Design a binder for this molecule. Structure first.
Ligand code: CDL
Ligand code: CDL
Ligand code: PC1
Ligand code: PC1
Ligand code: PC1
Ligand code: 3PE
Ligand code: 3PE
Ligand code: 3PE
Ligand code: 3PE
Ligand code: 3PE
Lengths: 168, 347, 98, 70, 98, 83, 96, 101, 316
């Protein structure tokens, strides 16, 4: 059952989404989105992306999601619909999991397969480097245009937010 | 707001739209949209009142959702073709989300409920940017991916926009809402001819921008935002009523004014493709636009509405508004029909 | 592009990351470099109306190397047949497959 | 006096020495008296797996020298 | 496609439906908006890593940087909505009907 | 000449931290242009052999390409052993 | 001091990298024979498993081209033990 | 598998201490006892987020120094850091980094 | 054997934290002209054990928390993450030999803010929330300088591998070429762990967030907090005071490396006894107006310095 680690994580990934998509109180909604983020990194790590997976923890979970929780505790004033949506979500997940595990082929918009994610991995690698790392480091040698527009947007984010929040 | 920061924010709105038009990569197209939405919110919040705050919120949620759908189309297109180039999409499901993402950004029906409300809650100058400049970026992408757009989807969004823009405008007294519904109606024409001749999509866009910019400029000169407040203009600036009459008649497509040229050329490019029912239905439904334009002509220029006593104090001061390019825009909005063959410069 | 500023100025703003058979750092190839190259060289210059018909063979191969749909159907068939014969006493896996 | 503070330091010092001493010894015990192989990059992993096939016994740390060559 | 893609692709659908059905809180919907980018982040990274599209390994980071900048702009509006009506309820934002 | 001294001696008294920050950042932007060893950084980076040196089919007219690694022809890393 | 030591470390990296280059030809030759053997081993089992199927060709390519295509994990370890498959798929990612 | 066991052990151990901490004294039987949004705090969080994102673009610098285009690489590296310092200056002069009303 | 390895790392950590409480109370005592614990066991060697038993058989409060599930999640997360930050530390051989270990420690360290934020919610007290917000704003502010300073140091090392820092310092400590960064790294670690002169949480007369906790749950927050004090000082010694590694005598490394890690942990106790406490607005200005301008400037200097001397480290 360790060969299907990626699929097991993806199932937990969806269940978390059904958690905060049903929209419980914001405190619990943010809690469910942290669980999905951690599971999301786990999936990316098992596909060979280590820098990308860790960037999720540092920037997404330890960054944005901290600001989300920080802003919730200060501007949120700490039902049947929630339970109804949550139960509806799990049932659809169960049936999708049930069928892809029975006949190993499901057609919903796209043709999905059920053999196992491991069957599409590359079979040959003998490099003395990390291919993912080389691509990201190319941001400075190849992505000159990307660096300029991204940096300017971040600078404008500082200017814009101060304008919006002044109130006068 | 500091004047220098106002220039910087505006140039970022332009830069976002320019990045979309010069990019051969879907990531830079998406970055262009994000830089555009980030910069335009501060000009909508500039007056610091609850209505502006509500308008900026409804705009953010709509444009944020539209951008997420667009990025989902790009990734699906990457999975099925292994490339990022800005061209025809290689999956029908990617095309639907891409076509629907752009429809939401444009404001086409039935993704239209935010255009009347956002345009109403922001100043006139912000509305002018929203209804003219913000339409360039989505139309640029449609110009490039039209070979793969679902015909029944693009023509269905076009027909609903023409209808909903027409009926919505009849029941309005606020000027900002009237232009918003007018903007929805003209979008349907631009996307109706897109599968057949994209050149006429640009011509109708160029003419619409010129005419719409003229109307907002004349409203801003007298600080008029309601039908009644516009009816005092005859007693303050008589010349400005004659210019409003001419532009309103132009927007309605009445010959021999400029606004008849796109309606004329779009009907031509659709009958060549044996499309007879749609152009007729489109042309007849456009009479709804001509009606509530004519209503403003009755209460502004063709009749003299009641005035107030304090108006006499206004006669002693001039107009200090900028009214930039107003003499040039008004002439281009009315006297360009004899130059119709010039559309070939757009090819 | 709507405006071809890059071609006019001869500046490569964003064309270096459009395709996966372009120049990569340290000459690292993509898994489907050969298939992408073949389709690109088939459809070059003839417009997309013709390429949709006269380069369909290359395109189907490229899409087979991307999503591997046909291969997974074939492996799935073999696994079922082996499983069916396994639960009848009619098959015997060799020592090096166990 | 000040030197009566040392006995607490010795206990705290010893507890921080066990984790380092234990890992070094356990690796050598489990790797036939050698350091545990370090495989950060794919090439190193490929060699280690190859060593597993060459050992006869399915163990990466059993090295075969010239005496295994004819 | 594959088995993992189904759940990632179904996680985007859940968040989209969650974003299109507001309950009361504005903060709740912003989470559904940041769930959408998380699913897109994972789905793109899976495609790029599996195909050895080396130069595209930087794209998911750019997706994360802009999506977080947009999220910051969203929270700022939520704060300014709460400083006016005393809560982040969407039903209060109904002045523009007329 | 006296205006600058008065200005510099005032920030050095009231804002020593900022004065240090700009001096350090200013050196990071200037020295690489004037440094004679910046060219050796590129040569070291180009000399590192991550990939395999695929050999070239011999046609006869290639006197600058060695037939064996230990032949004297081809690029030399002697400058690196002495750096 | 840092400049000197870093410079010595680059000369050491080249020496370590050149050892890999000197060995790649032997490792490439071994890998080619190991990949082909596993493909042939699967070919035999496919023939036995599907000798009586309604219209099945043994070892039929799914590509129109006749060019050599690198096998994926499913084609090599399709019918092997889970432990061997687990090592060849997640072994590197899970090592330490 | 090793990293998975390490995480399982640490959090499993922490849970045990927590539950036996809430129950061990409950093996005892003690008599039942019976019976504003701040704007500046929000701006600190947002300023951290925008700074934190810019750090994400700087983390791959050590690998970026291994390229053969050091002139281009060193130009963009100093551009990102300079832009990050420009954001700090803008907040500093616009009274963003203040705690007085 | 790996499972034995994990326990050989966890239990000694907790024992070290237990006797750090004693050492702290006695070093503080002698700097104050007194003794500290010397009655409970010889030289107070049984004082830590008495304190532990007392807390775990004392009745806990568990007030009417708004959730009652965050109240139990907060100490699990704090202690769970605190032990997890030790697994990649080379002493000299890591339990888990990560390629991006330095980045792993930043990632896990930035998650410790949730236990501060969650415990604020659970307390259900409006005032206790304000204290949690100030603590959270302090932690995120000072991990901006931790990330940039670490990046600057790694430019002289070449990788995020923690064991490569040992090779980098095989001829000389990094404290020599990068002492200005070491100063701002050392102070940034005090602010992260809410240590004097940066302990506003425990700094009564202005506020703490963990005020509603007593007995065992309180000890769990305490244990996690002190394990982070040892861990950050072990990180500092590896980063700036590299110890030479002899593969044949690994114990030699561990003894020298432990002595450095203790001396840096005692420096934390030394600094607590010597200075008064910062004001909240004053430690924020120490970061956004003094450290950050220098950290950004030194980052520019350290990106360019290796290039202009031809001293770029190897990638591997
Ligand atoms: C052929 C196509 C022809 C159609 C052309 C249509 C142009 C019509 C423009 C509207 C007329 C201007 C006006 O009445 O003022 C309204 C308004 C001022 O009224 P306000 O609300 O009382 O003041 C606002 C603030 O309080 C500001 O108050 P402040 O006191 O702080 O002042 C700030 C400062 C600021 O000064 C500036 O405005 C300069 C900013 C740089 C503009 C870009 C320069 C282009 C060259 C670089 C590239 O000064 C001004 O604002 C001057 C007043 C505005 C007059 C100058 C407008 C120039 C527009 C012509 C260039 C069009 C480029 C697209 C516009 C940008 C799109 C987002 O100014 C505007 O913001 C209008 C923006 C224009 C948006 C529509 C642009 C047309 C889109 C189609 C483009 C062509 C493609 C087809
Ligand atoms: C290519 C050739 C294009 C020629 C452009 C040269 C005229 C642009 C500069 C004029 C100007 O200051 O305002 C332009 C521009 C628009 O201001 P405006 O209020 O519309 O100008 C009328 C005022 O009454 C202006 O009255 P004012 O008293 O404030 O200033 C008198 C102005 C008088 O200059 C003028 O004549 C203004 C009217 C010139 C025509 C404006 C439209 C530009 C040409 C558009 C061509 C459309 C072609 C359509 C063809 C379709 C059929 C094929 O004299 C100048 O400033 C010339 C300075 C030379 C530099 O001002 C700006 O914000 C940008 C500067
Ligand atoms: C569980 C209880 C909650 C744990 C919270 C902490 C999460 C641990 C961090 C994830 C592991 C990691 O960082 O990998 C880095 C490291 C990075 O190491 P690396 O990049 O150096 O590569 C190691 C291998 N080499 C070097 C050969 C390439 O990952 C690994 O080393 C191995 C990856 C194993 C992947 C298995 C992950 C499954 C668990 C993820 C789910 C987590 C759920 C979280 C629940 C929500 C709470 C936030
Ligand atoms: C100002 C107040 C705060 C300052 C904090 C000061 C405490 C931090 C420690 C500073 C003193 C340095 C540690 C000295 C004791 C270390 C014992 C030791 O490891 O062997 C001696 C060590 C032995 O050296 P080594 O084993 O660490 O290896 C040196 C590495 N090379 C060879 C590259 C330089 O040397 C000394 O520290 C002598 C002093
Ligand atoms: C050739 C190229 C060379 C390039 C590099 C050149 C570098 C030149 C030197 C630059 C200056 C060096 C930087 C030093 C850091 C300055 C930080 C700063 O902001 O200072 C002002 C700051 C505050 O300055 P301030 O409060 O006095 O005022 C600031 C400015 N005004 C007046 C406008 C407000 O000082 C502090 O950081 C306060 C310290 C808090 C208490 C810390 C307790 C110290 C305990 C002793 C620890 C000793 C270190 C142990 C290290 C162990 C490591 C293993
Ligand atoms: C595909 C399957 C989609 C349909 C699955 C239905 C899942 C929702 C379950 C029903 C539900 O949510 O509860 C009833 C719903 C809202 O809950 P309700 O009890 O009415 O809350 C206020 C009561 N005073 O009450 C309603 O208003 C009905 C909402 C539509 C259902
Ligand atoms: C569940 C019941 C169902 O199957 O509905 C499918 C319906 C039509 O899709 P269709 O492909 O015709 O069904 C396959 C039949 N052989 O299609 C549906 O109802 C599926 C609804 C999907 C809503 C899409 C919203 C936009 C997001 C698009 C991203 C792709 C998501 C779909 C692929 C992943 C599957 C969830
Ligand atoms: C007391 C006054 C000073 C104040 C206290 C100072 C702080 C405490 C001291 C620093 C912490 C050190 C704690 C450990 C010291 C006791 C252990 C020791 O001295 O080293 C023992 C070590 C074990 O030997 P071993 O690894 O088994 O070698 C077998 C090879 N076949 O033998 C070796 O191999 C060593 C080489
Ligand atoms: C070519 C590539 C590099 C291009 C870099 C271009 C971008 C630079 C980005 C810098 C970061 C943004 C900082 C900009 C803000 C400057 C400070 C400021 O805002 O001015 C405030 C100050 C207020 O004045 P006041 O307080 O009233 O009175 C005392 C003032 N001294 O008013 C003042 O009087 C301040 C005076 C202006 C500050 C000038 C700073 C110049 C820094 C360059 C120094 C380089 C020297 C390097 C050589 C060192 C050799 C040892
Ligand atoms: C030898 C030659 C060395 C070069 C000459 C030295 C540099 C000159 C500039 C130094 C003076 C800076 C101007 C200044 O004095 O700023 C003081 C002012 C402080 O104001 P404030 O703290 O609010 O007052 C409190 C009173 N109760 O502060 C301000 O008002 C604005 C200060 C903004 C500072 C921005 C810091 C970000 C930049 C960090 C440096 C990174 C490098 C920048 C790029 C350099 C490119 C070369």
């Amino acid at each position: 059952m360790m060969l299907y680690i990626v699929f097991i994580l993806s199932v937990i990934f969806v269940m978390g989404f059904v958690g905060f998509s049903s929209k419980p109180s914001p405190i619990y909604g943010g809690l469910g989105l942290i669980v999905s983020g951690g599971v999301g990194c786990g999936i990316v790590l098992n596909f060979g992306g280590s820098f990308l997976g860790l960037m999720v923890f540092l920037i997404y979970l330890g960054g944005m999601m901290v600001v989300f929780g920080y802003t919730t505790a200060m501007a949120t004033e700490q039902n049947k619909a929630v339970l109804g949506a949550f139960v509806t979500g799990l049932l659809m997940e169960f049936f999708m999991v049930y069928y892809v595990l029975k006949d190993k082929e499901v057609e919903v918009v796209f043709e999905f397969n059920g053999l196992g994610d491991w069957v599409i991995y590359d079979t040959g690698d003998s490099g003395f480097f990390s291919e993912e790392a080389m691509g990201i480091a190319a941001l400075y040698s190849y992505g000159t245009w990307l660096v300029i527009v991204t940096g300017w947007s971040l600078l404008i984010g500082v200017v814009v937010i101060m304008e919006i929040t002044r109130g006068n | 707001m500091n004047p220098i920061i106002f220039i910087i924010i505006l140039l970022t709105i332009m830069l976002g739209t320019i990045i979309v038009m010069i990019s051969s990569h879907w990531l830079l197209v998406w970055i262009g949209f994000e830089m555009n939405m980030l910069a335009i919110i501060p000009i909508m919040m500039k007056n610091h009142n609850p209505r502006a705050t509500e308008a900026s919120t409804k705009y953010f949620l709509t444009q944020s959702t539209a951008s997420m759908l667009l990025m989902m189309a790009v990734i699906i297109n990457l999975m099925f073709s292994g490339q990022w180039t800005v061209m025809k999409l290689f999956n029908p499901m990617a095309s639907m989300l891409m076509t629907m993402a752009l429809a939401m950004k444009l404001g086409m029906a039935p993704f239209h409920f935010w255009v009347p409300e956002v345009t109403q809650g922001i100043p006139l100058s912000s509305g002018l940017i929203l209804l003219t400049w913000q339409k360039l970026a989505p139309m640029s992408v449609l110009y490039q991916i039209f070979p793969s757009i679902n015909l029944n989807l693009i023509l269905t969004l076009s027909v609903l926009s023409i209808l909903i823009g027409g009926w919505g405008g009849l029941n309005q007294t606020q000027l900002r809402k009237i232009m918003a519904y007018s903007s929805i109606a003209h979008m349907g024409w631009m996307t109706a001819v897109l599968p057949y001749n994209p050149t006429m999509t640009l011509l109708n866009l160029i003419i619409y921008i010129i005419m719409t910019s003229t109307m907002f400029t004349m409203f801003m000169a007298n600080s008029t935002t309601t039908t009644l407040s516009l009816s005092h203009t005859w007693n303050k600036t008589p010349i400005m009523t004659v210019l409003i009459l001419a532009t309103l008649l132009s927007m309605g497509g009445l010959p021999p004014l400029s606004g008849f040229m796109p309606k004329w050329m779009i009907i031509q490019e659709m009958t060549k493709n044996n499309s007879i029912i749609l152009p007729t239905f489109m042309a007849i439904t456009a009479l709804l636009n001509l009606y509530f334009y004519m209503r403003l002509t009755y209460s502004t220029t063709l009749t003299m509405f009641p005035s107030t006593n304090n108006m006499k104090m206004k006669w002693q001061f001039p107009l200090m508004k900028k009214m930039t390019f107003l003499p040039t825009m008004v002439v281009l909005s009315t006297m360009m029909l004899p130059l119709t063959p010039m559309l070939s410069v757009l090819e | 592009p709507f405006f071809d500023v890059q071609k006019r100025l001869g500046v490569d703003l964003d064309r270096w990351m459009t395709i996966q058979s372009a120049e990569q750092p340290h000459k690292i190839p993509s898994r489907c470099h050969a298939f992408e190259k073949e389709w690109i060289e088939c459809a070059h210059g003839i417009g997309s109306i013709r390429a949709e018909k006269e380069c369909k063979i290359e395109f189907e191969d490229f899409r087979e190397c991307l999503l591997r749909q046909k291969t997974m159907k074939r492996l799935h068939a073999i696994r079922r047949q082996r499983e069916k014969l396994i639960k009848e006493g009619k098959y015997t896996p060799p020592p090096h497959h166990s | 006096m000040w030197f009566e503070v040392l006995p607490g330091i010795a206990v705290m010092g010893v507890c921080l020495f066990i984790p380092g001493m234990a890992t070094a010894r356990i690796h050598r015990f489990s790797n036939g008296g050698k350091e545990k192989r370090v495989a950060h990059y794919p090439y190193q992993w490929y060699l280690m797996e190859r060593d597993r096939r060459v050992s006869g016994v399915n163990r990466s740390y059993v090295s075969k020298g010239l005496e295994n060559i004819d | 496609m594959s088995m993992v893609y189904m759940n990632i692709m179904m996680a985007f659908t859940v968040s989209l439906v969650g974003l299109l059905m507001y309950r009361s809180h504005l903060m709740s919907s912003l989470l559904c908006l940041e769930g959408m980018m998380l699913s897109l982040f994972v789905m793109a990274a899976l495609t790029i890593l599996n195909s050895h599209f080396t130069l595209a390994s930087m794209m998911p980071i750019i997706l994360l940087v802009f999506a977080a900048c947009e999220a910051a702009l969203g929270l700022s509006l939520l704060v300014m909505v709460s400083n006016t009506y005393g809560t982040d309820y969407v039903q209060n934002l109904n002045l523009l009907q007329c | 000449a006296e205006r600058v001294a008065a200005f510099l001696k005032n920030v050095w008294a009231k804002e020593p931290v900022l004065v240090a920050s700009f001096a350090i950042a200013g050196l990071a932007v200037i020295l690489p242009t004037l440094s004679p060893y910046t060219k050796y950084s590129l040569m070291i980076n180009r000399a590192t052999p991550y990939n395999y040196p695929v050999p070239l089919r011999d046609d006869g007219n290639m006197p600058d390409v060695p037939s064996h690694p230990q032949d004297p022809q081809g690029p030399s890393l002697e400058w690196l052993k002495r750096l | 001091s840092m400049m000197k030591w870093n410079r010595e470390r680059r000369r050491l990296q080249i020496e370590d990298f050149e050892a890999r280059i000197a060995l790649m030809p032997l490792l490439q030759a071994e890998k080619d024979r190991r990949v082909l053997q596993m493909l042939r081993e699967n070919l035999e089992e496919e023939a036995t498993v599907m000798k009586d199927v309604p219209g099945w060709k043994v070892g039929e390519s799914v590509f129109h081209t006749t060019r050599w295509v690198t096998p994926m994990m499913g084609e090599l370890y399709g019918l092997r033990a889970s432990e061997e498959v687990l090592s060849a798929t997640y072994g590197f990612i899970w090592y330490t | 598998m090793n990293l998975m066991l390490a995480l399982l052990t640490n959090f499993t151990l922490a849970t045990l201490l927590v539950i036996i901490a809430f129950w061990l004294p409950q093996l005892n039987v003690y008599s039942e006892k019976t019976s504003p949004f701040s704007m500046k705090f929000f701006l600190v969080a947002i300023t951290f987020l925008l700074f934190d994102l810019e750090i994400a673009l700087l983390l791959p610098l050590p690998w970026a120094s291994q390229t053969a285009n050091l002139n281009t690489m060193l130009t963009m590296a100093l551009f990102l850091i300079i832009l990050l310092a420009v954001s700090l200056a803008y907040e500093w002069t616009q009274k963003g980094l203040e705690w007085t009303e | 054997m790996f499972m034995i390895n994990i326990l050989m790392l966890i239990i000694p950590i907790l024992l070290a934290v237990a006797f750090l409480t004693l050492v702290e109370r006695k070093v503080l005592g002698y700097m104050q002209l007194r003794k500290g614990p010397n009655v409970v066991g010889p030289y107070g060697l049984l004082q830590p054990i008495a304190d532990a038993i007392k807390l775990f058989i004392k009745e806990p409060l568990r007030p009417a928390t708004s959730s009652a599930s965050m109240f139990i999640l907060a100490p699990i997360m704090a202690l769970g993450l605190a032990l997890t930050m030790w697994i990649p530390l080379p002493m000299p051989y890591p339990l888990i030999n990560m390629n991006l270990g330095v980045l792993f420690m930043l990632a896990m360290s930035s998650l410790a803010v949730y236990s501060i934020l969650w415990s604020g919610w659970a307390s259900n007290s409006k005032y206790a929330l304000i204290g949690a917000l100030r603590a959270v704003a302090q932690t995120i502010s000072y991990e901006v300088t931790l990330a940039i300073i670490l990046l600057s140091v790694l430019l002289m090392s070449g990788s995020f591998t923690l064991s490569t820092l040992i090779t980098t310092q095989e001829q000389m400590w990094l404290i020599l070429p990068a002492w200005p960064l070491a100063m701002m790294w050392f102070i940034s670690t005090l602010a992260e762990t809410n240590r004097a002169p940066f302990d506003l949480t425990e700094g009564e007369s202005e506020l703490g967030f963990n005020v509603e906790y007593a007995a065992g749950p309180f000890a769990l927050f305490f244990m996690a907090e002190y394990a982070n004090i040892i861990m950050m000082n072990i990180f500092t010694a590896i980063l700036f005071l590299g110890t030479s590694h002899n593969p044949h005598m690994p114990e030699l490394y561990t003894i020298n490396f432990t002595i450095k890690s203790l001396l840096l942990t005692m420096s934390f106790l030394w600094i607590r006894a010597s200075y008064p406490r910062f004001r909240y607005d004053q430690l924020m200005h120490l970061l956004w107006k003094n450290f950050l301008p220098l950290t950004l400037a030194l980052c520019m200097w350290h990106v360019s310095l290796p290039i202009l001397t031809s001293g770029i480290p190897p990638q591997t």
